Structure formats: structure tokens, C-alpha cells
């Protein structure tokens, strides 16, 4: 993997730096690296593809070195370099695709394609150059057995869920108390509703809880907490828990009372925020617990009081909600966020070449299933394929 990254990095640097008119002092080191790569790759034979519709390709390297004696590069030098660069880039592209399209239930972190297995050999260690990208450096740190971290903007850490729980319920669904929620991507919207507006509750306060556990620990997370669940603030016709019938939800929104948001690690409160909305920081957590109360307004103007009678007919249902968005975070394990395109690259390659479903990943690289059942083998394979995707994206666009 380090050799493959070095190949892609060398080719990208050759594309960027070997340009007409540039001083050779600008690319002396790069050309030494390029010649070393050519020497090491010469005389070796590689095969790629053969899975799905990915064609079987054979690669042979018999290239000549690059000049090192001009003062300023000219057009001839640029074309001579580009001819070799095209072939090397194609080889790297196909090796990366072959590695992406594959998976293994045991030792998913190790190379899976025969080309990458060959590059794992000691003879190719002369191609290492630089390891400065985020994914390659995290790879090297993990191998060295040190702390790793990927920084995500809107990490898709919540498996897609949209559901409700009814604590009080009847067949007619005329008088309900409970909660509804959507956990999607990097956002949690929760809304506790009570049809009676806590008329008969002790102290006219109804308590609501919502616990969202994560599949991986998030560190140094910036979060936005806002006091209304805009998704659960309009009339709705939902289908019963067992699907038999449908019930009505005509919410009227009240302020959430006694809002507590706790970020827990190993079941212990690491961070806790009370009645505080806006930007908050969770330093280290794997569970989010949101507690909030519907408190019946002790004082009501007539227009308000008419909404909440003390008898069964309830046309307006008192709802109080919270919205929590993870803007940024750091995680030890790879995830899918809104800024990176690695998941898109892997899924696109697999779909384009019609890879049969393997023994590890879910069909279509479904991120919801993957993050729902994020297992050790899945994490290893996902990190491997994402690292290869970053290596490939260095060259292909």
C-alpha cells in the first residue's frame, strides 16, 4: 500500500512539476525519484482485473530513464516524460480498481489483489518517497500502532432511522404520549409529544428521553443544538406500529423544558449541557442522551387555553423537540462524511464494473447497513478501500 501510494504520488508530482520552461533545480529530486521508480519497476510483470466486468490486463515495464542535464526543461523533455507517465498512471489506476473491488472476511487490512501483493515485496520498498496525505499517514500510524484520526465534516455516524415510540397508546390513537425521531447522517431530530399536554401528569411535566449510541467513538466534535424539531412540527398521518391502521398527529410546538444533553463514553458522562443551545463541544463520547420535558404552561391566555382541554377531545397535541447536528468530529475509524468522495469512488467503481456481492460489504455498499453493522472486518476492509480510493483520486479526475 505504501508502494502504491508512492507510485501515485510520484506520478502526480511528475504531472504537476515537469512542465515546459521550469528550472531543473525545481524537479531534480522528483526526477531522481522517478528514475528510481522506473529502475525498480523495470523487468517486472503484473496482472490486474478478472473480477466482474473489469478486464484482465497485463503490464510490463521496459522504460528508459529521464534526462537530468538540462538547465530548463523543454517541450521534448515534457513529452518524453508524459509518454511514460501515461502508462504508469494507467497501471496505478487499474491496480487501485482491482484492490477496491475486492474484499476478504479474514485479514481485510492486507492487500487482496495480486498486483498489490507483488508490490508488498521487499524489492519494491525502494519506492516510498513521501507519505503525507491524511489516509496514508493514518495507515502508517496504525501500522506503527499509534493513535490515528480522521477529521470529518458532517460524518455519517448515525444509521438512517425514522421511527416513533408510544408510551401511552390506545387502538383509536386519540390520546397518545411518546416520541418520534429521525437519526440520519450527522443529525438527530427528536420530538416528544403528549396529546393531553400533561393535564394529568405529576406536576404537569412529561419527561422524554432519546438515546443514540454510535458505532465508533467521536472526539473533539463541534455540535449545534437547537430547541425545535422542525421535521415533526406539521400535521401528519402515520401508520400504526404493526401497520394495521393510521393515526393523526396535529402538533402544536411548545418550548422544551429542562433540556439536558449528555455525551457519554463507556457509560459515563463526559460532557453535559443544561438549557444551552447553539455551538457545543463534545470531547470524547460514544453515546448521546437527550432528555427534555413538556411542561404545561401554568398561565395561558384564552387562545392558548382553548387548545388544551381537560377532556379526551384533543385536536392539538403538545410537542417539544430538539435538533442536534454534528458539524465536525474526529474518529479513529473511517466514516463517510459530506466533504470526501471516497465512498462515492468505491461505490462507483463497484457499480460500473458490476462486482458480485462479496462476503463482507452489504449490497451496493449501502452505507446505512454498513454503519448499522460496523464490524471489525468491515472496518478493516472499508479503511483499505478508502485508502486505495484516495490513492487513485490523486491521479484520476
Closest CB to a copy of itself among 76 and 209? 76
Q: Yes or no: say if 134 and 150 are a contact pair by the CB < 8 Å rule.
A: yes
**207 touching a copy of itself, by CB under 8 A:** no
Task: Report in angstroms how near the CB of residue 188 gets to a copy of itself at its nearest.
Answer: 13
Which of another protein, a copy of itself, none does 85 bind, CB closer than 5 to 8 A by kind? none
Closest CB to another protein among 271 and 383? 271
Closest CA to 350 of 64, 93, 101: 101
Listed in sequence order, the DSSP H helices in 42-159 are 75-100, 114-119, 134-144
Which of a copy of itself, another protein, none does 312 bind, CB closer than 5 to 8 A by kind? none
Contact characters 355-384, a copy of itself, x per CB under 8 A: -------x-xxxxxx--xx-xxxx------
Which of a copy of itself, another protein, none does 47 bind, CB closer than 5 to 8 A by kind? none
Residue with cell 525519484: 33
Q: Yes or no: say if 349 and 52 are a contact pair by the CB < 8 Å rule.
A: no
**76 touching a copy of itself, by CB under 8 A:** no
Binding to a copy of itself in span 110-139, by CB under 8 A: 110, 122, 125-132, 137-138
Say how far apart CA 196 and CA 179 lie, in whole Å.
Answer: 14
Among 52, 67, 149, 358, binds a copy of itself (CB under 8 A): 149
Say how far apart CA 229 and CA 134 lie, in whole Å.
Answer: 36
Query: Is 266 known as a binding-site position?
Result: yes
Number of H helices and E strands in the chain, helices first, is 9, 14
Binding to another protein in span 132-171, by CB under 8 A: none
Closest CA to 349 of 152, 89, 93, 1: 93
Closest CB to a copy of itself among 20 and 209? 20
Say how far apart CA 304 and CA 355 lie, in whole Å.
Answer: 60
Residues near 237 by Cβ (< 8 Å), separated by ≥ 6? 246, 247, 248, 249
Binding to another protein in span 22-41, by CB under 8 A: 35, 38-39
**38 touching a copy of itself, by CB under 8 A:** no
Among 28, 60, 68, 246, binds another protein (CB under 8 A): 68
**277 touching a copy of itself, by CB under 8 A:** yes
Contact characters 187-206, another protein, x per CB under 8 A: ----------------x---
Closest CB to another protein among 35 and 377? 35
Count how many Cα atoms sit within 13 Å of the Cα of residue 352 in the half-sphere of its side chain. 12
Cell of 99: 484492490
Binding to another protein in span 332-361, by CB under 8 A: 350-351, 354-357
Closest CA to 232 of 178, 177, 191: 191
Residues near 59 by Cβ (< 8 Å), separated by ≥ 6? 45, 46, 47, 48, 91, 94, 115
**390 touching a copy of itself, by CB under 8 A:** no
| CB-CB neighbours of 257 under 10 Å | 16
Task: Report in angstroms how near the CB of residue 286 gets to a copy of itself at its nearest.
Answer: 8
Query: Is 286 known as a binding-site position?
Result: yes
Closest CB to another protein among 315 and 352? 352
Q: Yes or no: say if 323 and 228 are a contact pair by the CB < 8 Å rule.
A: yes
Binding residues for a copy of itself, total number by CB under 8 A: 144
Q: Which residues belong to the annotated binding site for Zn(2+)?
A: 153
Provide the binding-site residues for another protein, judged by CB under 8 A: 35, 38-39, 42-43, 52, 64-65, 67-68, 203, 258, 271-275, 350-351, 354-357, 363-364, 366
Amino acid at each position: 500500500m505504501d508502494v502504491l501510494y508512492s507510485l501515485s504520488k510520484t506520478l502526480k508530482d511528475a504531472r504537476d512539476k515537469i512542465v515546459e520552461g521550469t528550472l531543473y533545480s525545481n524537479v531534480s529530486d522528483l526526477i531522481q525519484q522517478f528514475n528510481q521508480m522506473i529502475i525498480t519497476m523495470n523487468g517486472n510483470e503484473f496482472q490486474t482485473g478478472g473480477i466482474g466486468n473489469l478486464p484482465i490486463r497485463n503490464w510490463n515495464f521496459n522504460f528508459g530513464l529521464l534526462g537530468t542535464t538540462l538547465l530548463n526543461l523543454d517541450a521534448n523533455y515534457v513529452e518524453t516524460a508524459r509518454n511514460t507517465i501515461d502508462y504508469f498512471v494507467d497501471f496505478v489506476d487499474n491496480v487501485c480498481m482491482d484492490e477496491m473491488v475486492r474484499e476478504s472476511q479474514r485479514n481485510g487490512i492486507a492487500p487482496q489483489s495480486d498486483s498489490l501483493r507483488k508490490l508488498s515485496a521487499i524489492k519494491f520498498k525502494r519506492i516510498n518517497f513521501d507519505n503525507s496525505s491524511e489516509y496514508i499517514e493514518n495507515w502508517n500510524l496504525q501500522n506503527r500502532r499509534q493513535r490515528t484520526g480522521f477529521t470529518f465534516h458532517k460524518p455519517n455516524i448515525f444509521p438512517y432511522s425514522a421511527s416513533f415510540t408510544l408510551n401511552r397508546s390506545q387502538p383509536a390513537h386519540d390520546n397518545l404520549m411518546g416520541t418520534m425521531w429521525l437519526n440520519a447522517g450527522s443529525e438527530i431530530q427528536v420530538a416528544g409529544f403528549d396529546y393531553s399536554c400533561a393535564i394529568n401528569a405529576p406536576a404537569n411535566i412529561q419527561q422524554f428521553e432519546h438515546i443514540v449510541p454510535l458505532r465508533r467513538v467521536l472526539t473533539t466534535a463541534t455540535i449545534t443544538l437547537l430547541p425545535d424539531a422542525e421535521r415533526f412540527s406539521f400535521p401528519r398521518v402515520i401508520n400504526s406500529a404493526d401497520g394495521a391502521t393510521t393515526w393523526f398527529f396535529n402538533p402544536v410546538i411548545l418550548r422544551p423544558n429542562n433540556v439536558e444533553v449528555e455525551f457519554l463514553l463507556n457509560g459515563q458522562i463526559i460532557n453535559t449541557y443544561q438549557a444551552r443551545f447553539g455551538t457545543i463541544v463534545a470531547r470524547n463520547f460514544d453515546t448521546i442522551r437527550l432528555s427534555f420535558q413538556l411542561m404545561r404552561p401554568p398561565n395561558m391566555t384564552p387562545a392558548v387555553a382553548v387548545l388544551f382541554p381537560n377532556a379526551q377531545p384533543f385536536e392539538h397535541h403538545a410537542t417539544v423537540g430538539l435538533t442536534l447536528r454534528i458539524e465536525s468530529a474526529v474518529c479513529e475509524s473511517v466514516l463517510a462524511d459530506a466533504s470526501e468522495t471516497l465512498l462515492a469512488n468505491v461505490t462507483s467503481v463497484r457499480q460500473e464494473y458490476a462486482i458480485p456481492v462479496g462476503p463482507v460489504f452489504p449490497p451496493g455498499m449501502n452505507w446505512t447497513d454498513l454503519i448499522t453493522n460496523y464490524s471489525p472486518s468491515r472496518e478493516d476492509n472499508l479503511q483499505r478501500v478508502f485508502t486505495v480510493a484516495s490513492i487513485r483520486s490523486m491521479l484520476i479526475k
